[PDB]
Coordinates of N, CA and C in Angstrom, one line a residue:
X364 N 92.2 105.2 100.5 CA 93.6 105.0 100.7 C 93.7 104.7 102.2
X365 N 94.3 103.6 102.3 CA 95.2 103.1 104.0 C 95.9 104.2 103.9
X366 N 96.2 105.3 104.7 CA 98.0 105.6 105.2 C 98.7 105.3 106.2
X367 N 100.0 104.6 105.9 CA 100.4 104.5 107.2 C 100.6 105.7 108.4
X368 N 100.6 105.3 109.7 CA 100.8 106.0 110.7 C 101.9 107.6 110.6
X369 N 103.0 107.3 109.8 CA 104.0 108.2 109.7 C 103.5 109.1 108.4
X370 N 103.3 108.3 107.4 CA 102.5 108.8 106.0 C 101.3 109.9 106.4
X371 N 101.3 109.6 107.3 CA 99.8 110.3 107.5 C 100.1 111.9 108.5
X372 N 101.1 111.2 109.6 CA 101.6 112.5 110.1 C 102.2 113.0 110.2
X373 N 103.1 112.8 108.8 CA 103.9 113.8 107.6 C 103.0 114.8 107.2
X374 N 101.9 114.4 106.7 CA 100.9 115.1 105.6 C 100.0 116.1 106.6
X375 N 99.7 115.4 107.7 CA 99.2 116.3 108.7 C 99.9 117.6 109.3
X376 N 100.9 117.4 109.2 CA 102.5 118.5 109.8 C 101.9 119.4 108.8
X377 N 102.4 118.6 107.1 CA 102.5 119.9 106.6 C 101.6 120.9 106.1
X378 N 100.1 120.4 106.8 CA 98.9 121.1 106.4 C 98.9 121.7 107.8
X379 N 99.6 121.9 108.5 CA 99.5 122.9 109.8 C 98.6 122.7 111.0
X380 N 98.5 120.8 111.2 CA 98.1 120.5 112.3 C 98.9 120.3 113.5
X381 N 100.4 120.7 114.0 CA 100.7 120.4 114.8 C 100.6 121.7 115.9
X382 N 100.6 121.5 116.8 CA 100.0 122.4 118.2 C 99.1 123.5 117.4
X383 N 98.2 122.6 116.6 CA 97.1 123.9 116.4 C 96.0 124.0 117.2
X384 N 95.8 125.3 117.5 CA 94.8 125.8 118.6 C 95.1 124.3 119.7
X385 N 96.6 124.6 120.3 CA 97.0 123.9 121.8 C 96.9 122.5 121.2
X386 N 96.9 121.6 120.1 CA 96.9 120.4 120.3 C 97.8 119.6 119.3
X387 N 98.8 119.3 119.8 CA 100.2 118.7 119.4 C 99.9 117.5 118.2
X388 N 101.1 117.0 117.3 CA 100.9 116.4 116.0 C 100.1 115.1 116.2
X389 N 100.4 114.6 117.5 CA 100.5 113.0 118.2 C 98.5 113.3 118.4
X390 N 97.8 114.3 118.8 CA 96.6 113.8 119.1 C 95.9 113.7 117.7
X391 N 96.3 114.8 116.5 CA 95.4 114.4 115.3 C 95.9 112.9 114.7
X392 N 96.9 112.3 114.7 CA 97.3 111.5 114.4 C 96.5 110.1 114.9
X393 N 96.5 110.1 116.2 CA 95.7 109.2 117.1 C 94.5 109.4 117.0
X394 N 93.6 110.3 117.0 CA 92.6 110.7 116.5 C 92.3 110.2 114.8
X395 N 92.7 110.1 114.4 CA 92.9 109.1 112.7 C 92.9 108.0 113.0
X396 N 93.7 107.3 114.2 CA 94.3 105.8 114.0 C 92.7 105.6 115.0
X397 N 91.9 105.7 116.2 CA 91.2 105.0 115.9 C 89.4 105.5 115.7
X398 N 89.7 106.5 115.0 CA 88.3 107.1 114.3 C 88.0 106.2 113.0
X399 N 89.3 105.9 112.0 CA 89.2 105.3 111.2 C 90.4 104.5 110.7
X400 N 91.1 104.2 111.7 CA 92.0 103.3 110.8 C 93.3 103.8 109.9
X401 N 93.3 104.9 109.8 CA 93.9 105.4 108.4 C 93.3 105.6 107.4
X402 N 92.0 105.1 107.5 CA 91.5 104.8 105.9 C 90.7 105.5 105.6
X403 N 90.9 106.6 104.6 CA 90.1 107.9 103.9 C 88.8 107.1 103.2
X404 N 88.4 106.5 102.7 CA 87.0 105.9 102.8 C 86.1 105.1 103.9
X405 N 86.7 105.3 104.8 CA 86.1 105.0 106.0 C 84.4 105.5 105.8
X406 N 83.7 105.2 106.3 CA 82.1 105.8 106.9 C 81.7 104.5 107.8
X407 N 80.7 105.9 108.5 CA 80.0 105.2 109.8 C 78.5 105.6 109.6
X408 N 77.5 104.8 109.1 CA 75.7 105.3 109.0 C 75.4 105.2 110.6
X409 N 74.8 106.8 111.3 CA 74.6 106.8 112.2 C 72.6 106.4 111.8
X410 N 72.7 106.4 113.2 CA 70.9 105.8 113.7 C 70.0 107.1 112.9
X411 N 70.7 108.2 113.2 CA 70.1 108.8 113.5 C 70.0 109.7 111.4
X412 N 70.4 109.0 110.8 CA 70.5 109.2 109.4 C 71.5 110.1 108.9
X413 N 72.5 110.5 110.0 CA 74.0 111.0 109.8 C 74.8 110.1 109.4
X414 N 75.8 110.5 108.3 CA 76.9 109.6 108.5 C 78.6 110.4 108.6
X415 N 79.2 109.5 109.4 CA 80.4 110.1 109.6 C 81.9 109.7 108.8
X416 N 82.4 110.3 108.3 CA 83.4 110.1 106.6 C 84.6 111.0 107.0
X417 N 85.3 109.4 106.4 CA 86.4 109.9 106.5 C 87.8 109.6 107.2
X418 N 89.0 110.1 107.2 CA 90.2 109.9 108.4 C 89.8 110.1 109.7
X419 N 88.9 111.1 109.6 CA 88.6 111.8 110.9 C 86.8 112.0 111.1
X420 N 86.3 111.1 110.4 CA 84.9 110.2 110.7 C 83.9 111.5 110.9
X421 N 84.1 112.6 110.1 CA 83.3 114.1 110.2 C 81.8 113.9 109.6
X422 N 81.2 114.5 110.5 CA 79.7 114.0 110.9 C 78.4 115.2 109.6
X423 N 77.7 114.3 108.9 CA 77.2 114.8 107.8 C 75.6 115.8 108.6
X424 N 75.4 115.5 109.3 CA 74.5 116.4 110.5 C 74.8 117.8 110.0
X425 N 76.1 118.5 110.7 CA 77.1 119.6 111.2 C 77.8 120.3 110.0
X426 N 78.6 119.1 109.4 CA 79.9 120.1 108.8 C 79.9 119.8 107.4
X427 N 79.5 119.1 106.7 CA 79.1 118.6 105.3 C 78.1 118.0 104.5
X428 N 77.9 118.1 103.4 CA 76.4 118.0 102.6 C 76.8 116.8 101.9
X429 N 76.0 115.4 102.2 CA 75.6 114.6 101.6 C 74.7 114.1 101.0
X430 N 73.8 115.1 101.2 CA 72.7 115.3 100.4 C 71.7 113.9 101.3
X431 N 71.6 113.4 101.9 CA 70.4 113.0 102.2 C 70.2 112.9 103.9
X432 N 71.3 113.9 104.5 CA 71.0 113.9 105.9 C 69.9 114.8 106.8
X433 N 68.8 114.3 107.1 CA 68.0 115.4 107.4 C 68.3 116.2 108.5
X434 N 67.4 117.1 108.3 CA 67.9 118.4 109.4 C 69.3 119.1 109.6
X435 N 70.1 118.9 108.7 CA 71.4 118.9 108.6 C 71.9 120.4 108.2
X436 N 73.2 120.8 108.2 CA 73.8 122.3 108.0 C 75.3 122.0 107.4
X437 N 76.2 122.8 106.9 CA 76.8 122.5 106.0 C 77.9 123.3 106.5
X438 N 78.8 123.2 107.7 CA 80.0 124.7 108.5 C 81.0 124.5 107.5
X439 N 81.7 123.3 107.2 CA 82.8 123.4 106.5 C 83.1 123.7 104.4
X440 N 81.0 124.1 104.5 CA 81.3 124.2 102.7 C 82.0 123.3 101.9
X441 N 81.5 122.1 102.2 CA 81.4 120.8 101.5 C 80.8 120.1 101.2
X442 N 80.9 119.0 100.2 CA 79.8 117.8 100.1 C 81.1 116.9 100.8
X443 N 80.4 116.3 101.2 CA 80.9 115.0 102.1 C 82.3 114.1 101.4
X444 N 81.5 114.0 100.5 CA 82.4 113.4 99.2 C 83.8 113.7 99.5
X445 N 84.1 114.9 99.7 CA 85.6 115.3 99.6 C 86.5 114.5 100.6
X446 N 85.8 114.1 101.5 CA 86.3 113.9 102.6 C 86.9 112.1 102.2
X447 N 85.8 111.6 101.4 CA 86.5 110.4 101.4 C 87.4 109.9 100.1
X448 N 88.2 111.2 99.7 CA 89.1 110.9 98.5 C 91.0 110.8 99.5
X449 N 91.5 110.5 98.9 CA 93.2 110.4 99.5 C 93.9 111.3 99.6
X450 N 93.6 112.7 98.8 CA 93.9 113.4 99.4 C 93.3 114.4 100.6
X451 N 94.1 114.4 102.1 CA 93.4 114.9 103.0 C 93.4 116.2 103.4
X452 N 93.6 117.3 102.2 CA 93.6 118.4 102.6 C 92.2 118.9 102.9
X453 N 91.0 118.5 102.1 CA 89.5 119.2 102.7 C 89.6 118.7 104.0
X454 N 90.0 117.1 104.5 CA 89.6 116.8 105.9 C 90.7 117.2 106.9
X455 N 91.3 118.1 106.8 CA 92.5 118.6 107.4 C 91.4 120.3 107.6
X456 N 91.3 120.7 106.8 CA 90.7 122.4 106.5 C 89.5 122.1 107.3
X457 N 88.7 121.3 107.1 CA 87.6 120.5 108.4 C 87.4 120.7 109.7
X458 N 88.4 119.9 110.0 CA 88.7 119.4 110.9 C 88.9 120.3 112.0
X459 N 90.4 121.4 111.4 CA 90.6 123.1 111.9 C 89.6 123.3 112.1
X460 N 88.2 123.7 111.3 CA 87.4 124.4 112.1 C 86.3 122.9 113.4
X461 N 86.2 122.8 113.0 CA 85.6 121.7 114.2 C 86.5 122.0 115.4
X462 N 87.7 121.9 115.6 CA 88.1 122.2 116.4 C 88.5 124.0 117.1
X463 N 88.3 124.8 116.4 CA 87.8 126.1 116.5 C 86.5 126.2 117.2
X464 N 85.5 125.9 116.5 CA 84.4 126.1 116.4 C 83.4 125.4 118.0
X465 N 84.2 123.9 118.1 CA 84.3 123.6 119.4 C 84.9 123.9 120.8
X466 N 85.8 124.2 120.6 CA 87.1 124.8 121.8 C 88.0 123.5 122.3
X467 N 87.6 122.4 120.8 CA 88.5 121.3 121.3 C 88.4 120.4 120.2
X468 N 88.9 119.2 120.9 CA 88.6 118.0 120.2 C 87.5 117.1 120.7
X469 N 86.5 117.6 121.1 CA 85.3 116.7 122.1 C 84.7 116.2 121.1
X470 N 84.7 116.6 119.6 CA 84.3 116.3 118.3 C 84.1 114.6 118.5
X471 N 84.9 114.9 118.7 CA 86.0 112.8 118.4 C 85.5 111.9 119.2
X472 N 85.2 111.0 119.3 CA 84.7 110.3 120.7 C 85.9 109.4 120.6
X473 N 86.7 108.6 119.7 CA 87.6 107.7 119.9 C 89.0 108.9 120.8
X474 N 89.1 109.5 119.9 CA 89.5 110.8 120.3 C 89.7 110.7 122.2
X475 N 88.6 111.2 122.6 CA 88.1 111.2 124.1 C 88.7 110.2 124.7
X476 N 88.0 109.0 124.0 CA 88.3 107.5 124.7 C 89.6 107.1 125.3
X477 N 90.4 107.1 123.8 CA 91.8 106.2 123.3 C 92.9 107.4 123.3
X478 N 92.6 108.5 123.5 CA 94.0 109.1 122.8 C 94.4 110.1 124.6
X479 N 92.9 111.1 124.8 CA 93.5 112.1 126.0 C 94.1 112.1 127.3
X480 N 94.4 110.5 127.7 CA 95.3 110.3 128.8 C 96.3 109.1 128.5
X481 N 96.8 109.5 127.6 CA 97.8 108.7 126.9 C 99.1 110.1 126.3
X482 N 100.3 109.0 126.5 CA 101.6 110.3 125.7 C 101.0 109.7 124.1
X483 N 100.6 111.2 123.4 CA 100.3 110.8 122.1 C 101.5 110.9 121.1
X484 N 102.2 111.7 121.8 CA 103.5 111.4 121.2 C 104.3 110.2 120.8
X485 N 103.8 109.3 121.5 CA 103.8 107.8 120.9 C 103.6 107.7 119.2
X486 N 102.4 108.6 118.8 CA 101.9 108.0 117.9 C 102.6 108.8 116.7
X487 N 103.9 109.3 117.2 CA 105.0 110.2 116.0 C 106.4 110.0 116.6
X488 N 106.3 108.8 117.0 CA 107.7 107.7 117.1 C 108.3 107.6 115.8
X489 N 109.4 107.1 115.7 CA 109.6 107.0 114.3 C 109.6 108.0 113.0
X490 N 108.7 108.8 113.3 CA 108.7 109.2 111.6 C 109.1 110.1 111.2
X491 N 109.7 109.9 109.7 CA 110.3 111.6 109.5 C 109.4 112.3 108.6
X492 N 109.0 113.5 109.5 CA 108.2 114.6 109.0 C 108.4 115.4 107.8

């Protein structure tokens, strides 16, 4: 599923991403728009035989079991799979810890790039929550 930009940070509100652990609605949002587009079947096959799935492009190494990533560990008690269906409550529940477990969003590299010296509040113009 595409969601659009407001669709998406509707759904993110009301799964309890806004100012969680210090980080307002606008950066998970932006963080979606360009990790993946919107699009919950998103994947990225890394080099290194990781792949990253998802709204929020979550790395099969670390946080979920896809069964063929070597050397890999499993933090969020998942198979990967979950992450690339339309509904985004597993990659919402994810995500929280990644960002716990980190002390941030350094997870993200678009994230880093595109979103942390920018008003991300831009990116919850418009929408009703």
């Amino acid at each position: 599923k595409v969601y659009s930009r407001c669709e998406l940070a509707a759904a993110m509100k009301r799964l309890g991403l806004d100012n969680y652990r210090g980080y307002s609605l606008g950066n998970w949002v932006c963080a979606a728009n360009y990790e993946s587009g919107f699009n919950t079947q998103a994947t990225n096959r890394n080099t290194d035989g990781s792949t990253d799935y998802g709204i929020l492009q979550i790395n099969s190494r670390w946080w979920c079991d896809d069964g063929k990533t070597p050397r890999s560990k499993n933090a969020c008690g998942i198979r990967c799979s979950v992450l690339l269906r339309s509904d985004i409550t597993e990659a919402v529940r994810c995500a929280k810890r990644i960002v716990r477990d980190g002390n941030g969003m350094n997870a993200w590299v678009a994230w880093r790039n595109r979103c942390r010296g920018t008003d991300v509040s831009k990116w919850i113009r418009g929408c009703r929550l």
